[PDB]
Chains A and B, each alone.
Chain A
C-alpha cells in the first residue's frame, strides 16, 4: 500500500457504513483506553501479593480470584494491556513495513538486489532467536519494551519478506505494468503506484497473525531474563506462569488468554475490513 490517492474520501465514505469496520474500531478504541488509563478500571496495585490469599475463587473482593503468589488477577490483566499491546503492535508494524519493502524491492528488480536480499533472508531465517537474544542482550544495560520490539522485529521480518517477494513476482509481468512503462514512469514509480496496491493482501494476512505470535513469544524471552524486566505486568508472562496450575483443576490461565484472543480478533477484523476496501464488491 503506497499510493491509493484519487478518492480517499470515497473509500473513507464507503468504509464508514461497514458494520465490520465499526465494530472492530470500537473494540480497538476500548483496548487502547484500557492500555492508556488503567486506573479508571481498578484501584488495586498489580504488583502487590498478599500470600495469605494464595488461590481464592472469584468474589466481590477479587473479581477474577488470586494466583499462587496472591496477586489480584483482575488488576494484573488490566495492567498487562500496556506492555502486551505495545509489544505486539510495535513489532507487527515494524516487520510489516521493513519486510514488505525489502521483499517488494527484491521481487520487482531481480538482478542483484534480489540476490543480496534473498541470501540475507536465507541467513536470517535459519538462525535461532534465543541464541541471538542471549548474545545481544549482554550489552544492553537495561531491558525495555523497545529492546524486545527490536529483537522480535529483527528476527521476524524474513517470512514477511518472502511472502511479499512472491506476491510481487506474479504482478510484475502484467499488462498494466507495460502500460505504465509506456506512459513514462520509472521502475520505482511503477512499483509503488501500481504494483504495491495490487499485491498487498497476503502481507496483511501474515501480519494479522504475526501480531498474536509476537505477543506470545515475548514471554518466552522474558522467562529466561533476556527481555522485559520482571516488574512489568504482561499477558503471556501470566499465561506462562499459570499453565502449571492446570492439572489441579484451576482455570486461571484463561483470563489473560481471553484478553489476548479478543485483541487478536479485533485486529483481524480490522485488517480484513481494510483489505476489502481495495477490491470492493
Chain B
C-alpha cells in the first residue's frame, strides 16, 4: 500500500536528457532547449503562432536596420534578488561570442560589428569584447551591425540572447549544474532530493516574481525522460503521462482510435531534403544539373507522405517550410517538384547525351533514427522510374556519419534537413546556400543568389522582403542544389486530466497554458 503518491497538480510531460549543461549559449538541441525556454525570458517573446512581442525591452528603436537602441524595463529580477540590467545582456552576448569559451552557439553572434576580433583565434587578436555592443546606462544599450538586416529584431526571442546573473561568470561550470533564470518557471525547490535527476526527470515550479507574456496556469511541470517513444505511448494510454508531444511511427494509424479527440495536429517549421555533393562523378556541371532535376521528377511525394508517414508530412512546394510567414505555394516554376516519370527519363537521357551513367547511386543515413522506411521508398521509386540501381546505405555510428559530411569526404548522396530557430524564411536559406556557409555541405556557389538574398535583407519593410525572397527562390528552382522532400506536421496527444493542449510554430506543446484541474 506504501508509495503510490499521485500528481494531481503538476503536469507530466515527456522529454529527454539534455546532453549539455543548462547554459543558454551552450545548448542547440530540443531536449535542453525546452527546459531552457521554460527557465529564462529574454528581450522578446513568441506566441503560439510565432509573432514577436516585447517582453523585457521597453523599446527597440531603429531607423535604418543597422543601429539599434534597446531600453530595458525596470523591476525585473533573477530568482536570487539581483536585477536584470543592460550589463546582463551585454556580458552574456560577449561570453557567447568569444572563441576561447568554446560555445556551440557562437555563430549566432555573426551580424554584430567586432565579431571577427573575438571569434578568430585566441591571442592573435586582443579585444575580448565585441565593439558593436555599447552600454549607455544600466537600463539601455546600443547595437551596431555589419549590414542592414530586417530580420534582426525577430531573432531577439531566441534562447541565445538570454541574460545571465553576474553571479554566473565567477563559476560558470557550477551555474550550468543549477541555473538561475528570470522566466516563468524555476527548478523545483528541492528538499527531497535534487531537482534534476540525471536520466530520470526534471521538476519545475512556477516563479512568483514573473510578470510577463507567458504566465503559467499549472502548479509545476515534470519532464519524464523516456527512451523508446512506444513506451511513452503505453504510459499515456495507461494514465501515467499527461502530454505525449509526438506519436510513435508504429501508432500513426491507430491513434485516431485510441486517443479519440484527445489529439491535435499542426504544422511545424522543419523540412527534409536529399543532398548529392557537386563533386561526385557525373554530378557536376550542367550534366549534373540535369541529373538533379531528373531525380526530383522521379519521387512520388504525395504517395510517400501518406503511405509511409500516414499524414505527418506535407509534400514540398519550395525550399522552406509551410508554416513560415510569407510562404507561397504557387510560385512560378515549382512544377519542377511534381512527379513526372516521362520528364524524369527525358532529363536523364539528355544528361547521358553528355556523359553516360556508370555506377551505383547510394543514399546514406545514420541507423536507428527512423529513416529506413522513407529512404527505402525514395531509393525504390528512383530505381523504378529510371533504370539505374539506387540503394540505401545505413551507417553504424552518428559520429562517423557526421565526420564524413564535415570533412567533405563522403562519396554518395545523403539525407539532410533543416530545423528553424526563429520564424523567418531567410533563416532557412542563408545558412545553407550561400557561398562558404557552414551548413553548405554540397559545395554550391552562386554569387547571383548571394546578391539576391542580401538584397532582401536590405528591404525597407518585412512585407516586401518576402517578395524578394520568393524572387530569389527562382534561382534555386533553376539550379536545384538539393532535392526538397517534405515539411513536418506535429501530432500531440493528451489525457483526460489536462485541458488546454496546443501546438506551437516549431511543433512543441504550449507548456505555459496547459490547464490541469
Contacts and interface: CB of A to CB of B under 8 A. Distances in A.
Interface of A: 49-52, 54, 68-70, 134, 223-226, 230-231, 241, 244-248
A134 B367 contact: no
Contacts, number: 50
Contacts of A225: 367, 393-396
B254 A230 contact: no
27 contacts: A49-B380, A49-B384, A50-B384, A51-B307, A51-B377, A51-B381, A68-B373, A70-B380, A134-B397, A223-B367, A223-B394, A224-B368, A225-B393, A225-B395, A225-B396, A226-B396, A230-B391, A230-B393, A230-B394, A241-B372, A244-B250, A245-B250, A247-B250, A247-B251, A248-B250, A248-B253, A248-B254
Contacts of B254: 247-248
B431 interface: no
A270 to B, nearest CB: 36
Given A51-B307, A54-B307, A247-B254, 7 more contacts: A69-B380, A224-B368, A225-B367, A225-B395, A244-B249, A247-B251, A248-B254
Nearest to B365: A225
Contacts of B253: 248
A156 to B, nearest CB: 20
Contacts of B395: 224-225
Nearest to B364: A225
Interface in B142-193: none
The 7 A-B residue pairs whose C-beta atoms are closest, nearest first, are A225-B394, A134-B396, A224-B367, A247-B250, A244-B250, A224-B396, A49-B380
A50 B385 CA distance: 11
Nearest to B380: A49
B308 interface: yes
Contacts of A230: 391-394
A81 B377 CA distance: 24
B391 to A, nearest CB: 6
A100 B391 CA distance: 41
Contacts of A69: 376-377, 380
Interface in B1-31: none
A231 B391 CA distance: 8
Nearest to A130: B396
Interface size class of B (residues with CB under 8 A): 20 to 34
Contacts of B250: 244-248
A169 to B, nearest CB: 40
Nearest to A243: B250
Interface in B345-397: 367-368, 372-373, 376-377, 380-381, 384, 391-397
A110 B240 CA distance: 57
Nearest to A249: B254
Given A69-B380, A225-B367, A241-B372, A51 B300 contact: yes
B357 to A, nearest CB: 18
Nearest to A241: B372
Contacts of B461: none
Interface SS of chain A: loop
Nearest to A55: B307
A39 B403 CA distance: 44
A51 B303 contact: yes
A217 to B, nearest CB: 16
A229 B397 CA distance: 17
A224 B394 contact: yes
Contacts of B307: 51, 54, 68
Contacts of A50: 384
Nearest to B381: A51
A76 B356 CA distance: 33
Nearest to B400: A134
Contacts of B251: 247
Contacts of A68: 307-308, 373
Most chain A beta-carbon neighbours within 10 Å: one of B303, B307, B393 = B307
Contacts of A224: 367-368, 394-396
A241 B307 CA distance: 16
A269 B317 CA distance: 60
A178 to B, nearest CB: 54
B380 A51 contact: yes
Interface string B417-435: 0000000000000000000
Nearest to B392: A230
A230 B397 CA distance: 17
Contacts of B384: 49-51
A42 B35 CA distance: 57
A50 B250 CA distance: 22
Contacts of A248: 250, 253-254
A68 B254 CA distance: 16
A245 B381 CA distance: 21
Contacts of A54: 307
Nearest to B373: A68
A246 B253 CA distance: 11
B407 to A, nearest CB: 15
Nearest to B372: A241
Contacts of B373: 68
Contacts of B372: 241
B344 to A, nearest CB: 16
A280 B249 CA distance: 55
Nearest to A229: B391
Interface in B268-317: 300, 303, 307-308
A224 B372 CA distance: 10
Nearest to B258: A247
A52 B304 CA distance: 10
A245 B251 CA distance: 9
Contacts of A134: 396-397
A72 to B, nearest CB: 14
A241 B308 CA distance: 13
A66 to B, nearest CB: 12
Contacts of B393: 225, 230
A226 B300 CA distance: 30
A54 B381 CA distance: 13
Contacts of B381: 51
Nearest to A68: B373
